Amino acid sequence: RERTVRLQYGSRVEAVYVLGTYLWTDVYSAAPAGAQTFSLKHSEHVWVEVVRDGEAEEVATNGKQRWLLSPSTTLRVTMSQASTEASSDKVTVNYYDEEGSIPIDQAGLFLTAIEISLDVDADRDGVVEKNNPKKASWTWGPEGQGAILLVNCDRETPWLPKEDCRDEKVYSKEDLKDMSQMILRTKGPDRLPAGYEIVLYISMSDSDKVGVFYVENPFFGQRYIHILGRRKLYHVVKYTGGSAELLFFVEGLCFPDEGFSGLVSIHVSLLEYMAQDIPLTPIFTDTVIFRIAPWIMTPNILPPVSVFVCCMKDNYLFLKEVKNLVEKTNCELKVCFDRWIQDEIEFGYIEAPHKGFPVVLDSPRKDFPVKELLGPDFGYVTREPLFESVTSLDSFGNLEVSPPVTVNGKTYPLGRILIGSSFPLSGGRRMTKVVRDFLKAQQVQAPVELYSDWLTVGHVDEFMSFVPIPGTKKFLLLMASTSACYKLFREKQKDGHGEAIMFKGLGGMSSKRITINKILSNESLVQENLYFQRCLDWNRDILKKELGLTEQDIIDLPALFKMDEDHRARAFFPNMVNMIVLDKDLGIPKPFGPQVEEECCLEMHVRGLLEPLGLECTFIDDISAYHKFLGEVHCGTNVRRKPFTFKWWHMVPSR
Amino acid sequence: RERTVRLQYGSRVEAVYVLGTYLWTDVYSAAPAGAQTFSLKHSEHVWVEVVRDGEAEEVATNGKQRWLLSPSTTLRVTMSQASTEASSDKVTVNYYDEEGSIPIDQAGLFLTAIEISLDVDADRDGVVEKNNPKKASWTWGPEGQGAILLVNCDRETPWLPKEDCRDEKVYSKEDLKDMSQMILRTKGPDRLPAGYEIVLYISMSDSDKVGVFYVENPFFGQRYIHILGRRKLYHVVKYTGGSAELLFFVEGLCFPDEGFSGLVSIHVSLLEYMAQDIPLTPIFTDTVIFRIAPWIMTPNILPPVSVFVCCMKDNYLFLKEVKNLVEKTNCELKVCFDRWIQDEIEFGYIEAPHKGFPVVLDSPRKDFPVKELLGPDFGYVTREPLFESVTSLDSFGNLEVSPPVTVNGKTYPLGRILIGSSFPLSGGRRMTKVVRDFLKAQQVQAPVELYSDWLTVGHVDEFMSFVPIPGTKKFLLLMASTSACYKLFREKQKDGHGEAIMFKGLGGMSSKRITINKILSNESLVQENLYFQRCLDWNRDILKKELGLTEQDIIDLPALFKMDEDHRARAFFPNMVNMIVLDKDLGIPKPFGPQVEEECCLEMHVRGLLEPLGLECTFIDDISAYHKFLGEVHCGTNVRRKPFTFKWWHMVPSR
Ligand SMILES: [Ca+2]
Ligand SMILES: [Ca+2]
Ligand SMILES: [Ca+2]
Ligand SMILES: [Ca+2]
Ligand SMILES: [Ca+2]
Ligand SMILES: [Ca+2]
Ligand SMILES: [Ca+2]
Ligand SMILES: [Ca+2]
Ligand SMILES: [Ca+2]
Ligand SMILES: [Ca+2]
């Protein structure tokens, strides 16, 4: 970087030189009128070139050489090392008139060289490298660079209700582990020359996106000073001489969102004092950029860590069977004494090269948010509509994510988020804009809308799920199918089982005496379910298109629905597709289907589809404690999973 | 694209087939219980494959072949040509039980094939190609594709005050020349089968960004029907059989801006009627994308078309000298009987492959906008602050643009917009956010802020300009320089000219008796101008950095300023840098400098700098009619230029 510093007529100029720049110096304006030629001297650590109309010649420290004074003959001045107390760094120019060799005037430039660099971990290894030339930009991909910042959305200590980033304070040194390091490195003499200061600053816009802390170690203990952030746009730095480093810690306050790309900047400037009432001049500025890490969800293929379960204390069969299932795995079981656990929360995560933690997204309200999961390295985020009203499609049974897929040659290494919606011209329900905008803004999961509004509850988890194919890297899409159910029931009827009773053992259903015959002879129900299969198939097509799936990737599970007053579907028997996936082990809702030879024909059919693939099926009964099934699921489960091995910053999302 | 169509148990399915897709067909669900095998027949124009667990085999029109019924044995159904009235397009499946070869049931699929394509000029040649596979995206660059739309911001007829895009109506066929063509091409039989319709639609969000018109030619004359746009989100299309095209014309209503990327979409869907109270199902959807063309400014290097001038009727010397100057060129002179022409307006342009026109940007208010330039192929756009108050930095003397430059290897083929500002920590003036956001959003001119707030008026045009180097492809940056002025005056003083008088012929200045001696002996004025040179040099450095310029690209013109109460600069004598550039011919403000040998030494110095380069200098006197110079320029000029030859869509801007 070339910087302009002119000699001053008759007088001397003192200037700070920042390493990494160089000066072009006009010697012509300072020359007295009528002066003909000039000569120069310079000190050992200052390199001087005479540049005549573009041609540069290096000049000795003490020469007698003279050049003609011209506006197009100038100096180029360079320094490679910072000044010390032992330094006298200078260039002096002597001027001569036509006759005589004794100087008629002199002008001089006194320099103090300093190093100033604001450094971050741009190369994404967790340590802060010295002056990465790419630190002022942010690029995606394995070859990409620029520093990454976490939203510090967890909570270090229990004594306050709020996430760490909601204030300007740090109470605990553990908090600094969540932050990104930024070091201001300087080198120079004992003090800056008179009239200079170094200042760190951010824009007003970024002031609600970041906070920056400095750690002091005074007499009575470590303390944490907020130097940049909400209502603090600049900080005057205390300069220390010699080679010095100041360590800062940076926290993100906000996720990427509608209107915020996630990128923020921090600057340091060397300022020069001019006069009173005149603003200080930014002599040198160095900038670093951070990108705030996105919130990322976890598909069912990922390794399970903890199974969170909610039910009533007396649903014993449910708790026993879930406990049994989880005992086949290495997962933790966590129980709370009832659908809020699947509907109100989605477990995501955030990651930076130095750290990562799980983060809960809280569904919009339910008159109160569930914040009780907020804790050390367990974060919280929520979005609420300002105007738009919430519907069932805002529940997180309506929020899921695919396994990694490749679609028309484009890879989605983190999978793609799936949310249920209605048709564009329908006037139907849709998830709130505020949540949709949030998911879209995270960018790395490239969300897809499916059609869920044909269902009364309206959730994608009612009709589809994903399971791994054991011993491989592949997966299957499972789809609810009414046609599969009618085919199976018609077969059992032909086989002599038409009088087989459903809902056996649910005493509240007994008086209805529902049999295969009764179901198959209901004409209006057949028509309704043909229509629901059209709805399922429309979704099948969107999923095949947007996930790059073929029929080879899909298994259909028998399902049956009943239509409500709105022409929307509710489950006739429990939806088996919405299942707990722990690797090869599947907790499947117990369907209570028609009994043939004392086994449920739905259970037997589903085992016949899944077991050959090495999937182990356990049927879980959540409804027996309620004595009947009306289409409503009472209990809930949510599985917190390990994050993807693939680092999100290694993706290259579309423009 | 694979689409799911199932056979129905016991009955026949009728479906529309859209060319460019194909069907996968489940024959298993429709099979009666106990059926063993199936056979199939199909018509001449329907291709049928039996797919058994992924392996596909083509099947004859009438075969007797039978396959085992399995959920994993399905059909793949393809058609390559649209149905006519002569068509019977069908597939029929027969089912068989274990014993006997006579079918026990049959299920069939009756097809009507149609072509539906919504087409635009994606390849950017001005004609609408048939089904460009890239029409649903928009990419930058010479290899890029996707269709382009102009904001239709001009006005076809004088009888209405408003730009064409402010309403939903088209009164004149000339308006259609500004719009982008979009054709819905279809092929099929005399009518769509019962229960289908074709509908065009847009999102609510895009409804204030576009309008779409269809031209009808009824008995009494051509008429223009608004089918999509403000308060019209969909249009049901009238289907015509055989091979048919419907031509639509699309207009943009809004420039890219903060929160609007410039991209918009239009969709066509084939909808299927299900029942009453049930939304129609989108069987097929085709999408095209448009990008709205950005507003682009013109640097001084571009060929001049028209010179717009404003002054008082009696400034005769000004009008004569401007007329003379323009007579050396091929430009039009346009006069209005005074700084508003440079301050209130910036002439830009817009371009699409089919058309382009100049567009005026109107500075924010001046209690009233200047709309009187609005006319046929001369457009208008303005931005007004909702909250923020306007300052002098919002005037368009503060809005300029560089010639094409390359900076650190990155090319800016349209140049870079330049606007004056204050330092980040200064609390100084800055152009309003609404205008800055607009300029940034156009993207192709990548704006740079300079430091203008050291000037009382605060405009970049006060201190810098660009001129072409005649007979080359190169250009120079011209900078105001106080050091150049002091050097020249000190030389003339040494030469015996200290008593040389400035402002000769301005009678209102005579009593002041301003001489070279008087100027040079004013100590406080020297200090002020040293400070102003620091301000100029700070700008010189930003310009060299952001435009990729060296000292070889820069000429300094003598200038002098006086400081006001705010420590800001006003011109001491007219600023010569702000000049009319018509190729090699330069109209330069007459400085009224000290007379030496009956010529102005400032004029002679400037000719000495510029004339060797082949630049022809004419000094233009706008102040003699006012008898004095207080630092204010009374007249104004603005030159409308030819657009860049380089097409903006061939650029590749940063992410
Ligand atoms: Ca590093
Ligand atoms: Ca805190
Ligand atoms: Ca924390
Ligand atoms: Ca933590
Ligand atoms: Ca969920
Ligand atoms: Ca074309
Ligand atoms: Ca109109
Ligand atoms: Ca028009
Ligand atoms: Ca026009
Ligand atoms: Ca301008």
Swiss-Prot record, chains A, B:
Binding of Ca(2+) triggers a conformation change that is essential for catalytic activity. GO terms for biological process: cellular response to leukemia inhibitory factor; chromatin remodeling; estrogen receptor signaling pathway; negative regulation of chemokine-mediated signaling pathway; negative regulation of lymphocyte chemotaxis; substantia nigra development; transcription initiation-coupled chromatin remodeling. Changing D175A: Reduced enzyme activity. It comes from Homo sapiens. Ca(2+) 1 binds at D121, D123, D125, V127, E129. Catalyzes the deimination of arginine residues of proteins. This is Protein-arginine deiminase type-2. It comes from the Eukaryota. InterPro entries: Cupredoxin (IPR008972), PAD (IPR004303), PAD_C (IPR013530), PAD_central_sf (IPR036556), PAD_N (IPR013732), PAD_N_sf (IPR038685), Prot_Arg_deaminase_cen_dom (IPR013733). Pfam families: PAD, PAD_M, PAD_N. Its EC number is 3.5.3.15. Keywords: Calcium, Cytoplasm, Hydrolase, Metal-binding.
